[PDB]
Every structure is written in structure tokens, then in C-alpha cells.
């Protein structure tokens, strides 16, 4: 709140011998992924707060595990983005601009809708991560490629879990009428 | 389909208060949950700002500041968790979208870009102070309305928030071990 | 160093002063129980991997706890079996021959069917453990009798839990059509 | 044990935006590696139970550590194989069909022969993991490639340790007759 | 060192509703097992201090684990013996009188002889524990019978381990001359 | 508080292959022991709250350790009682009916009276446990017999400790007038 | 130099209140911090006394008393830490010298020498009671002045202090297992 | 607060076979060191409360570590002083009389002045400890000599750290004007 | 492998460059201290088992802490004694010969007598440790001197505690008849 | 047993099926990276010992964290290097020959110079690790490539931190003269 | 790498009231011991990496424990040397100059030769530590003397353990031909 030292959207020097021709696209991509994960952190946390119904106890725990993991991804991305000379996004307006998926609207939806929304979000992020990992590989930034692969594996795992929640099976099918 | 047709069907609508299981009247839970959403949004703003500061702080005292900013946004996250759970418990609908968070926060986030460590600490202190003001107002309201649990929760959070403000103030004080061998302004 | 030192199916010396007339049938029985628990470990672990649907999170956890406990039983049995001069079973073909229940067929079944299959397996094993405990008692091998009783109690406990999963009650009965 | 939902040998849908042209070969390969590791888990565990003689205390511990680590590999593989829409192997007969090495025969061998057998098993598995990692890389499954590399490093480490046990050196050479 | 309250060799009252016809023989037996375990604790500890040579690191650890476990047996026995109204043995002379095996003579023996001596000691103790467990069972002292069975299983396990150390196998047989 | 599914006093099915001719008397006995332990939990907890005087600090801690242990017994009994098809007691009136000892009257008694009351309670429970263990043994329910023996040993140990508190010895006898 | 020349230069002067970062007026922070210094001094006195008792207690119940006195002075140390940090945060200057501590404590420390275990426990109880009185007064003051964080902090400390008083009272009660076989007075 | 049993300044009996010609000077010295450490505990704690400015976070932590360590020294000294028959100092007035350095005056000084004051205090205490250690050695109280040496090493280490804080170096010298 | 390799009472080689003229008397003394601590371990443990009456809970705990600490001393002494080329004592007869105090006679004494007996034992051991520390110092074995001083301080501390138990003070003096 | 078994500079057998044409250059490179990290471990540790001045507390901690992390890298590299049939460097002279950066000269430099020197060292090592990772990839040694990428990411992270320490910002700029 | 503040080989001021007539020889000696321990750390670590053969598992662990302990000695020495105003050695060339033993040559030796080399190194270090402790004592630096005695005891312990590994005893002597 006064005199800027470094401007958002510019890439500055780094101490790890990468050219700014590498760090500019790499940090731009990191900001997209950071914004997307902030959007997803907020959404999972909302889901944690509001989920109700017969399986809410397990969903409540899963949503908490999930936003904690997303928070870890955020921490690793922000630290590396800054390390490489980038300026990390932090304002609501810019986060909204950069996120690769649109957050769930305000209000409370069903547990199935929440899980669907989280899965579509993870899928959007998977797409971006794969693109950014390929770019890092091509540009010779192994550290970034490896970091993205670690995060990708965890992200794919969350998607697996979400898919499991949505599957059309239940112990109740033994004594309730199927659709 | 028609633009006004409902895809994704809402159960609770934002801005409205629903039933609660703890025998509090809506005359209590409506203002209490409205206030919780302001505090929630403000703490989300501050979490993001402290975390930004954690990422970007540099210079001669950055190691201590880096750790302090991490501790601080972790604590703010704990406040957020307690508020959101109770807000929902009382029948309210917690805010979660970037646009509404920006509308409800009681202070304006630091602009994009990187500022000095002193400016960052000043910005965090001004944010904590804004939040202190709202928490005191909301705690008094909860007291007057008979919501003891909310009043107590706010007092727990207030004490931690005041503590962060004390630390921020200490970082800003015009003293340093370096004064023994550098030229004072 | 290339030749067999002990042959499967024979009992050798033991250092705990038990007659080979005791250790032969005791270790033969341990091998049946070992094989049965390997079969069940594999089945629980499969169930852990594939279970899906509305209660999958709790079932996923339960199946993991269960195969970890079964693995502990296997460890205790194998160590004691060798200690008593027996040769423990370890090949796929012989495990299939000795197991007291037939593994679930390859493919994926419903969560209710998986739970039913695990319960039937635990019940087969309970039967064998009771017979082997009685034998150890009769033959004067207190240590084996006691070990089996410890394992029996845990095995009975898993059966209780499985039966709870199968019971025809749910929170959903308040708002879904029964039958 | 009644109505199959999904058939072994088929690949189904996944939630991580991979084409079945990728997930079919990847999950087929995972099932070979899963079966191989189950064979090795059983063999290491056998070795833990039966190893004896002057260095048995160290070997006993090493074999325990090793089958625990192999069990972790199995858990990771099974979870991912299922996530990608595959059906994991779990029956004795199919495991025997798919394993890339032949288990040690029933009976007890010498400590040196057990260690040689475990080393040959790790080496077979190393070969398959390398082929499957190269495949994952070529097909664009970074998550799978990365997971295999993590597992490869640990597997290579076990091979190093087995090789060290076999080396023709001992403190006893100071006072016993060398061959 | 002045005025005795209770005399060694007498059984006094107990608070667990057992007749002195039961507690007299039970506590007499506990004192034999207590003395035997004190003898074995001292012997294992000696072995821990003095064991040397090519496998001493493993033997050193094993002997430490073993005397720690024996100390736990002693604690349980002494507490129960006192609870049942008995007076526990504690003097060197009486311990020597009651132990069911003769301690290793002063001096240092070879590692193989130390292990043989510990095995013979465990075997003597196994015999007494079995007789005392049978007695407790016949007299209706279930608590005592159960405690002995717990201790028996651990004692048998130590005997298995000692037997494994003595087995005529070694990795060194690949490159040293066998007798 | 509306429509009963299962009635108190009836035994239902179990999944561990025991006949209802076994589980009826076994679960009836478990309810007596459960009620008795609830009575004792409440009494120990009261004693924890109200004990005062020169040794209150140690007594306060002992009473807390004791009711925590009794709570563990309760947990194990209730779970098994339900597992075997029984319906566990939980109302104040029925607990009062089934307890094998009468709770201390309301009010605060001396520390010695409290300890005496707890000892008489443990002694009542010991009697019932031994009877129920014998029954389980006779009826072939090994798991129940073993569970009771574990609990019996802990219960006897509490009785030993209580007896120790009551003994007519004190460090104060060196400088206070004896009765 | 002249005796009135300043060697070691003071930044804050004892007895005065400076700025705080938590939006409380000096009309609040002056009496609040004055009271905190009394409570701080009183707890330092009690820490020293409990620790003395820990060192010197002997006799038939000394093992339990020894442990209790240790637990107690550790807890008092925690109270001291919370008070001192908040006192400074609010702009006050915490007392630390032996002379001023002796002036401000709300009870008189036990005299040098060794007393009986009963007398030691009586002295500790009387000290806790003095401190309970001051804490209740200071909590009421904080409430009336609108310093919720201070009021809450004092209530946390009060509950622990009351708990120590309950335990002390229990040690003093005229009951013992020995009454079954020794002559009552 | 009534009838003294033992008087301050007198030395009483001890149970460790030291003559009162030893314990009188040893305990007198322990009281000087105890008083000095209480003075320093209070001063470090004050510094913890009041330190502010650009390095306050590290200083705040250091001052807390330091007064915790001083508290440990106090505990060891008081226990041993009493053990040897001495009466430990505890009143503000007597502490002020016996401390070997004068506490910082009331008020808040600069961080550099605080660190200087703490260093001068540690230096005073080092002097006394060395004198008292030499005395203990001369008088044959090895335990006291050893205790003082343990405390001396920690005290010297605090002095090293304080000296490091005061040194005329800073990362800021790269971009601020030197004096 | 059956014959003695080292004889009791003789010193053998050491690897720490100490003359056998040092290690002979040092290890002879270690054996006296070892035997004395074995005697005290047994005595404290007896006291732990049998102590009863109004303060038994605290005494029970103290005796356990004490014999655990004595066991640590024994471990350090035995290891160092062997390290220096000595042969550690381990038989009942030789332990009785070397202990520097006579064990409490069989039977049960009062709590005050037990505490008095433990104090007399600690005092005997303090005497020997001081003599052996002085010897090690004179002979140039710093390591032994230091080890003894560590043990001495803990031993003195136990003596302090024992003397506190014996002091003629009690909370009960407020309401029982003195003398 | 006195003669060299393997010569430095030669590669020997490996058990992971890699051609010696791979393991020779891979292990040669590991030795350069090992030597470079030993040089850096020593330098960071020196910096830890000697750093002083206004920010020394944070720098002291950072240097410790850093050399602990470097030590972990050394451990992983040395183990793998030996595993692949290489001989690891360990002598001062050869370490000096192989390190990819020159250690700071003896004596003490300013905190800013120490940090600059550590940054230059990390940057030299980053260069070598990237070259060696690329080589491992090209030669088909995935495990080595992956290990290097893990180490690279941690090494890049230390470089980020060092550069943060060096940045021309401070809280002191608010009240000291710039330039 | 620019402007020295302090020169190697000079002693500067200290804050613990020791004359430079004391700190000069003390810090010179600390640098010899520091260099010797760095040499030994590197040698033990090498041995950890390369040890192989029938007892390698135990030796591998022992060497790891040993270099970890040596690293702790180094940390303590460097911190104290700096505290006393000395400049610690850190370059390969100077370390080689100051070490009191010559490192093992590059290459791999047998396990027995490695253990012999480590023992000779410990023995060289024991000699220097004893001389430096005597010096510290004579010069009045109690802190330094005490620190050396702590380190001496651990160093002697490592020498005991190495000696035990070298002893001409093995379990294998029961079935292999002795030289």
C-alpha cells in the first residue's frame, strides 16, 4: 500500500541459472495453477462446511483432507514461482481472472453436485498441469517438471476418490428401491 | 434451454438463514451469521495476504518474517475453520466465491506486486486492526442477543488476533542491533 | 548351498520340548490357517482397491484395517510354525490348495457382495481356528492354544463388523423408498 | 460370488482424461507388476520366517523391511490401476500366471540361496518396471512414469543390499580357512 | 533390618477370594519362576556385556532385548505373587537355591556356548512354566494360568530365536571351508 | 423413542457360528458384568471427585486410573455382547437391577471407607467373572472365556492395589502414636 | 560524570503507558496494565514460594507434595508469560526488579527458613486466595472498560488458580488412611 | 507463616556422608548462585516480554530459550542445596542481597543494551561458578563440582551467543551507511 | 567352543591404550560396584513388590524409578568393565561376595525399615564410588572418573529422596497424636 | 585381508542390469557431485560456527538446516554410487581435486560474503547436477535421473533462500541511512 | 572470497573471561581434534557406503551410528572453538595438515581392514583428547576439560565396539574349519 518494488506480470532475476525466456512462461503458468488451486481450496473448504446428509461424516473428512493437500500444492508453487523471479497472484479479482475453472456459485448444493463440481475442477487443473509439465520439460526446467509431476499424481488421486464417491453402488441397494 | 432454467439445483440460497439445532431464534442467527460472513471474508483476504508475504518477503530479516507470516496465515486458517463450521451450524450459508469475498471483506487487500518488508508488515497490521474492530462489534452483538457460544468463540479469536497485532507492531519498532554500527536516519 | 535343506510337509526339530507327534499336526494346521489368511489378505486388499459408491470411504478404510490385522496374524503364525519345526507354505499353488475358503473370482462385485464374501471367509477361518485351538489344547501345546484364542477374538470382531455393514438399516430410509 | 459388475481383462472409464488407448496397456502392465510384487512379498516373508544360522538376525530384519516395502509398492500400484479404470488381479491362479519370475519352491533353502533367489526376482521386476516406465512416458502418462521411477529406485536399492549380502567377504576370514 | 512383619515361606491373606490351598502352591511356584528368571536376566545381561566376534553386533542387541523381556516377566510375577499373599524371593542365596537351572560359571565363553547356555536355561524355564500353568488351571486360578501362558509364548519365542542362531548355516559357506 | 427393532432380553442372530443356546446365557451374563462395571465406574469417579486428606493426591490419581480401566472393560464387553446378538443394558433403572453390588450411598465417606467399598465391589465382580468364564469355557465360547480372563487379571490387580492402600503401615508410624 | 547523567538510555519509562496496536484507548490500557503488573508481581512471588516448597518439602507425603508444587509453579510460570506479553502489547512496562516486585505483590512471601508441610500448604492457599481476589477485581474492570481479550485471559487464569486452591484445600483436610491404625488427636 | 523448623543461614544434616565443614560453604555458595540465576531469569524474561525492533523475533526466541535454561539450573541447584542440608533462598529482599550482579533497572532499554546487560550478568555468574567449582573440588564434593561444570558449559555457551548478537556485522551493511 | 576363553579375576587386552596396571584395579572396582548395584536393584524391586500402607502408591512408584535408574548404572558399568578388558561378575555367589552392603533379609519389613535399608545401601555405594573415582583420577583413567561422577550424582540424589521420606513431618500431624 | 579389493577410478559389477558403459560415467559424475557436496557441507558448517552480528541467529539456524540437507544428499549419492559398482571418494586430496567449486579460504568473512559464497557454490552444483541428470536420461538410468531431480529441487530451493538473504531490503531502512 | 575480517591461526577476544594464554593453546588443540574427527567422519561414512559381505548389515548400521556421533563431536568442538575466539579449520588442505591420523587410501578394503583402520584412528584421537583434556585442566578451562571427557567416553566406547568386531570368535566356528 504505497511504493511498488516489483510489478505483477513482470519476471525478475533468479539465482538458479535459468534464462528469463524459461522463467517467464514457467512463472506465468505457475500463477494460473496457483489461482486455480486457490479457487479449489475455497470450494473444498466450503464443501467441508456445508455438506450434510447420510454420508456427510465421510465427505466432511474427505473435503478437509483435500483442501489441506491443495494448500500444500499452493505453498510449493508460490515458493518456487517467487524463487524463479515471478510475482505471485493474491487478489480476489486476479485470482478470478486466472483460475482455469469457475467456482461453484454461492448457495448450498447436494452432496452429489458438490462432488461433481470438485471432480470437474480437478480435471481442469489436470489439463493445465500436464501442459505446464510438458512446457517445463521442453524448456529444460527439470525441477519444475518434477514438482508438477508430484502434484499431478496427488491431483489424479483426488479425482479417483471423487469418482468413487459418485459411483452407482451402495450397501443400501440391498433394501431400498433402485431408480 | 432457457437462460432462467435451473441447472445445478440449490438447497440453501445464499443470503438466507435456515433452521438450526441449538434452540436459537432467527432474530439471533440472522445477524450472527451475517457478521460471521464478514469476518470469514476478511480472514480469507488476510490469509491470502499473509501467504503472499510469506512467498515474497526478502532481505536481511526475511528468515524470521517468512516464518512469522507462515505461522500467522496458519492461525488465520484455524479461525476460518471455526467460523465456517459454526456459521453453517447456525443455519447460514458461508461465502466462498472471489467476487463475494471481495464485497464482504472489511479491509482492502494489498495490490498485486511486491512491496517492501516494512510496507507488508504495515499492511498486515492495518488488516488485523480492521478485523479487531469487527470482531469486537460482533462479540458485543452476540452478547446482547444471548449467543454465548458465539461470543466466546469471538473472544478466543480476538485474543489471538490481538497477539498477531502485538507482534506486527514489534517488527515495526525503530530499534535494531545494527544501530550500534550503522548511521541512524 | 543350492539344495533343499528341509522338505515341505515334514516336521523337523524344535527347541521347546514338544514331541514331534504334537508339532506335526499343529504345524500342518498352522499351514491351513496361514494359507486361508493369505487368501483373505489378498481379498480384503482387492476390496480396498476397488470398492466404490456412496459408502466407499468407510469401506475403503475398514478393508485396509482388516488386511493389516490379517497380516499381523500371518506374521505370528508363520514365526511360530517355523519355530515348532514346520515348513511354512508360500507358493500360489499350495496356498490355493490349503485355503479353507475359495477366493472371490476375478472381476468387480458390488460392495454388498464383497462384504458378504469377506464374512463367509472369516466364518470359514473361525471354524478352522476353533478346531485347531481344541487340538492344541488336547495335545498339550498351550502356547499355540493361547495364540489361536487371541487371533480368534480379533477374527470374531471382524465378523461382527462385517455383519453390521450388511444390516438392513440406513439413515437414508427416512427419505428413500424401501424394498 | 454372484453378479459381476466389471470383468477382469477389460478397462473401464477413468476420471483423469486419459484415453483407453493409454489406460489399457498401462493397467495391463500394472497387473503384471502387481502380481510379481505379490510373489516377491510372499517369498521375502517366507525368508523372514525360515532364515537361520549365524547371520539370521540381520537377514530376518532385512527380509521384514523388504516385504514391508514391497507391500507399499503393491498398495500404490493397485490404487492407481483401479483409478485408471483397470481391474486388479487377486486370485492365486492369476497371480501365478502374471508374475514375471517363478517363486522359490516349497521347502527351506540355505540363506545364500534365499538371497540369490530374491536378487533374481528383483532383477526380473527391474526389467519390467523399466519397460513399463518407458511405455508410460511414450504414451503421455506422467503420473504413472513418475510412480514407476519412485518404485524403481527402491527396488534397485533392495538389489544393492542383496548383492552386498552375497559378497565374498567376512570378518571371519581373519580366523577361518577360506575355500 | 530389624522387626519382620511377614515371614518368607508363609502365605498370608489375599483380596481376590482364593483359598490358601490355592495360593500356597501357586506362590511357591511363582518364587521358583521368579528366581529362575533372575538367574536368566543376569546371564543374558552378562552375555550382552561380553559377547564379541563377527556376529557380536546382532547378538549384543538380541541379548539386550531378551533380558529386558525377562525383566518384564519378573515384574509381572512379583506383583502377582505379592497380590496373592506370598513373599517374593530377593536374596542371592535364596535365588540360587530356587532357580531351576544353574547359571553359567564366571568367565567368558564363546558366543556359541553362551547361546547354548541360554537355550538350555529357557528350556528349563519352559518346563516349570508348563507345570505351574497346569497347576493353576487345576486349582481354579485362571488369572495365574493366563499370565503363565502369556509368558510361555514369549519364552518359547526366545528359544526359537536361540535355536536359529545355532543353526549350521551361514552366508560365509559360499567362500569358507566347511568342517 | 418410537419403534423398537429389537427387544431387551431377547438374543438375536450372530455371525460367528455360535448357537443361541450359547449366546443367550453368555450375553445375559455380559449384561450383569456390564451393569456392575457401570456401577463401579460411577463409584470410582465419585471417589476421584471427592477424596481429600493427607494421601488424597495418590488416591485421586489411582481412582482415575481405575475408572479409566473399568471403562475399557465396559467397551470390550458391550461390543462383544452386541456382536453375539445381545442387547446391552443402558438405563439407570435396569443397571441398578443387574449390578452385582450395591453402589455406595450418596454423600462423602472417609478415604478408608471409599477404598473398602471399592474393594468389596471388585470382589463381587471377580466372583461373577469367574462364574461367567467357567460357563463360557463349558459352552465352547473360547473368545468370551479369554476376554473374561484378560479382564479378570486387571480386576484382581485393582483389588491388590486397594488392599495395599488399606494395610496398617505408614511412614508416619515413626513419629505418631499408634492406636 | 555527574550523578544525574544518563548511562544506559531509556526508551520506555516504568510507570508510564505507551501506544498499543489494538485500538484501545489509554483510559483502558493504563488501568489494565497497572493491574497486570500487580498480578505479575504476585505470581512471581508465588512462583518463588511454590518452588521453595518443591525444594524443601519432606516427610511422609513429600513425594506427592513435591510433584504438586512443581506442577503448580510451572502453571504459575505460564500465567506470568501470558500476562507479561499482553502487558507489553498494550503499551505497559512490566515489572522485573526484586524491590518493585516486593512492593506490588498482593501477598507477603513466606519468611526465609523451613516450615512444616501443613504450614507451606496453608501459605500457598492464602497466596492463591489473595490472587483470586485481585483477578476477580481486574476481570470486572476489564469487562467494564471493554477489554474483552483481557477479561477472557483473566478468566482462563482464574479457573486454573481456583483449581490449585481446591487441591491445596484437599491436602489440608482432616482425613487420612492412617486414621485406621493411629491415634486421632 | 508461624513456627520455623529450620533457620535460614544454618546447615543441617545430610544423607550423603559429607561433613558440615564441606556442606556449609558449599550450600552458602549455592545460595549465591541460586539468587544470581533468579535475578537473571527475571531479566531474560523481561527482555523476552519487551524486546522490539527489526531483529526482535530472533531475540524474543533466544531470551525465552535462555530463561528456560536458567530455570533448569535453578532447579538443579535448589534440589542439591536442600539435599546437602542447606536452606534455599526465596524472598525478594534476600535474593537482592545475594545476587552477584545488579538487575537491569525498571524501564525498557534498547535491544543492544539488553543483550549487553545479559552478557555482563552471565560473566558475573561464570566467575562465581568457577570459584565454587574450585572450592567443591578442593573440599572433595565431586558431585557438586561436576554439577557446576555442567552448568558452567551452558552458561559459557549463552555468553558466546550474546557476544555473537553484539558483533558489528549485518547483512544490511551491503546497502546502509556504516557509522 | 565349549571351553573358557577368559578367566574371571584376570584382565585382558583393551583397545583404549590404558596400561593393564590401570585396568586391573579399575575393573576390580567396577565389579564391586556392579555387584553392589545388583544387590540394590534386587532390593528396590522387592520393595516395589511388597510395599503397602498409607503411602504405598508413592513409594511403589519411587522404588520402580529407583531400580530402573540402578539398572542403567549397571549397564554402563558392565559395558565399560568389559571394554577395559575385565570380566564382569554375574553369579549369585560371587555377587554376594562382592557387594559392599548386605541385602535385606527375606521376609517383609515396614515401609520405614525398607526406606532405611535402601538409604544405608546407597550410602555404602556412595563410599565405594568416591574411592573408585579418586583411584581412576590418580591412575589417569578420565573416562572412568567421569562415568563415576555421573553415577555418583544420581546416587546422591536417590539418597536425598530417601532421607525426605524418612523425615518426621506429615500432613497428618494436624489431626493425629504425635509421639 | 590387508590388500585393496577394488581400485578407485574403476567400475565393478552391479546387480541392477546396467551396462558398465552406463555405470562408469554415472559413477564418475556421482563422485564429482559427492566431492562438491562434501566441500559445501564443510563450508556451511563453518558458516554455522562463525556467523555473527545482527542476524546471526537466523543465519546460524539456516546454515545448520542447509548442511544437514547436504549431508542427506551425500548419503543418497554414496549409497547409489557404490550400488552401481563405483568406488566413492573419501580422501581430502581427492575431494579437493573433484569439487566443482573452490572452498572459501581459511579465516572469517562477513555474513554477506559467506552467503554469497554459499550461493556461488550451490550454483556450481546446480550446473553439474543438470548435466549429470541429462546424461543419466540419455544413457537409460532412470533411477539416477530421478534421484538427481529430487536433489536438484532441494538445491534450487537453498539457492532461492540464499538470494533472499542477500536482497537489498530490511526493516531497518525505516530508520537508518541508506547507501 | 574477498575481505577477511579475521585470520586463521590467530585467537581473538572471548566473552567468558579466559586469558588468551589459555584460549590460544586450547583453540589450537580443538582445531587438531576437529580436523581428526572430520577425517574420521569421512572414513566411517566411506565404510558405511562400501562395506559388504556376510556381516555387512550390522557393520553398515554401526558405521552410520558412528559417523553420526562423530558429527555431534564436531558440532560441539566447532561451536566452542569459535566461542573462545578461535577460527575453525574447514578447507581440505588444512584438514589434511592437522588430522592426527592418515585417512585410509582411496579404494575398497576388506571389512576387517576397514574396522582395523577405524580402530587405529579412534586410538590416535584418544591420545590427543587425553593430552588436550590434561592441558585444559592445568590451564583452568573446566568447560573444555569437561567437554573433552564427554567426548572421550564416547570415543572409547566406539573403540570397544570396533575391538569386539575384530575378536576371533564366531557362531560359524561350530561348522567351518578354523585357520
TrEMBL record, chains A, C, D, E, F, H, I, J, K:
Claim: NADP is one of the keywords in the record: no
Domain named Ferritin/DPS: residues: 31-169
Residues reported in the UniProt entry to bind Fe(3+) 2: 60, 79, 161
Family named by the database record: Belongs to the Dps family.
Binding residues annotated for Zn(2+), in chain numbering: 48, 75, 79
Record keywords, A-Z: Metal-binding, Zinc
Chain coiled-coil ranges: none
Name of the protein in question: Ferritin, Dps family protein
Residues involved in Fe(3+) 1 binding: 48, 75, 79
MF terms (GO), sorted A to Z: ferric iron binding; oxidoreductase activity, acting on metal ions
Organism per entry: Nostoc punctiforme (strain ATCC 29133 / PCC 73102)
Cited Pfam families: Ferritin
UniProtKB/TrEMBL annotation, chains B, G:
Protein name in the entry: Ferritin, Dps family protein
Taxonomy, superkingdom: Bacteria
Binding site for Fe(3+) 2: 66, 85, 167
Keyword Protease in record: no
Keyword set, alphabetical order: Metal-binding, Zinc
CDD domains on file: DPS
Domain Ferritin/DPS, residue spans: 37-175
Keyword Metal-binding in annotation: yes
Binding site for Fe(3+) 1: 54, 81, 85
Protein family per UniProt: Belongs to the Dps family.
MF annotations from Gene Ontology: ferric iron binding; oxidoreductase activity, acting on metal ions
Record: residues binding Zn(2+): 54, 81, 85
PROSITE patterns (alphabetical): DPS_2 (PS00819)
Amino acid at each position: 500500500t504505497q511504493t511498488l518494488l516489483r510489478n505483477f506480470g513482470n519476471v525478475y532475476d533468479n539465482p538458479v541459472l535459468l534464462d528469463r525466456s524459461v522463467t517467464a512462461p514457467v512463472t506465468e503458468g505457475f500463477n494460473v495453477v496457483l489461482a486455480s488451486f486457490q479457487a479449489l481450496y475455497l470450494q473444498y473448504q466450503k464443501h467441508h462446511f456445508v455438506v450434510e446428509g447420510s454420508e456427510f461424516y465421510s465427505l466432511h473428512e474427505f473435503f478437509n483432507e483435500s483442501y489441506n493437500q491443495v494448500q500444500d500444492h499452493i505453498h510449493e508453487i508460490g515458493e518456487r514461482l517467487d524463487g524463479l523471479g515471478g510475482v505471485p497472484v493474491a487478489t480476489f479479482s486476479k485470482l478470478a481472472e486466472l483460475t482455469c475453472f469457475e467456482q461453484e456459485s454461492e448457495g448450498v448444493y447436494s452432496s452429489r453436485q458438490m462432488v461433481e463440481n470438485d471432480l470437474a475442477a480437478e480435471q481442469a487443473i489436470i489439463g493445465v498441469i500436464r501442459r505446464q509439465a510438458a512446457q517445463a520439460e521442453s524448456l529444460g526446467d527439470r525441477g519444475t517438471r518434477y514438482l508438477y509431476e508430484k502434484i499431478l499424481l496427488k491431483t489424479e488421486e483426488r479425482a479417483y476418490h471423487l469418482s468413487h464417491f459418485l459411483a452407482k453402488d451402495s450397501l443400501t441397494l440391498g433394501f431400498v428401491q433402485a431408480a
